[PDB]
Design a protein around this ligand. Sequence first.
Ligand SMILES: NS(=O)(=O)c1ccc(C(=O)CSc2ncccn2)cc1Cl
Ligand SMILES: [Zn+2]
Length: 258
Amino acid sequence: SWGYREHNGPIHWKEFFPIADGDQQSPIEIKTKEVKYDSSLRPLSIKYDPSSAKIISNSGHSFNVDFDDTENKSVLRGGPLTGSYRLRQVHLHWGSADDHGSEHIVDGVSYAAELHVVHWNSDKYPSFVEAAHEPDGLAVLGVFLQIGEPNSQLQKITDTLDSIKEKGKQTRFTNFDLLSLLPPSWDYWTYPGSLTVPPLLESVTWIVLKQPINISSQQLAKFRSLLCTAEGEAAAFLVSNHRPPQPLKGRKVRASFH
Ligand SMILES: NS(=O)(=O)c1ccc(C(=O)CSc2ncccn2)cc1Cl
Ligand SMILES: [Zn+2]
């Protein structure tokens, strides 16, 4: 199955999910001179309940913090969105070097990593799985990480990693104040796109914050010590898990600010 190693990595995904070569694929290059300021975009309306976080797991592809998405305690509204998008899960993408780890790239700057906050449209769809197949179904908030001072909220995640080193492992994780993890400015870019992992469905309204948050180099390096292999299989490390930028194909990237 798919991964980020030589034989199964991004350049091969098109062979086994042809929508990899679709018209609305993510991530992208964000060219700030090409983006259009749009006065109809709204500020983000963000409500994240720290008690919504329940479990952290290693998928083999990243870690995932799963939130209880039974009801509307944690939702994203506003921004480019119509209606209410329910928080489902948080995960991270990084590279082998601090030099180049994010998925979206801004005027050629990669960041050290990129956090994705995944939400689904419960005002139109009954479940995440249904929403994931529709153009208006999902909203992802992307937040860049740059190397700087250690991040006390991220230290809570890094403290769990030894317990989920193998693919498939999980452990309880709650009291996670996602709202306080976001940067001071919520100015953003937005465009229509896709999941950045198989199945690569073109169901995502991307919301990428301009301002990065900081992480230390030692905290970021802990993520690379997760395995992409399960207990009992020959070990291989998830040292890098970001997809390259994909063609814009005529989409409009809009800015909430100017
Ligand atoms: N890179 S990305 O585009 O932000 C992205 C990555 C993975 C997934 C999922 O596979 C589903 S959210 C979920 N995943 C596993 C279990 C329960 N919910 C969805 C998205 Cl939008
Ligand atoms: Zn992601």
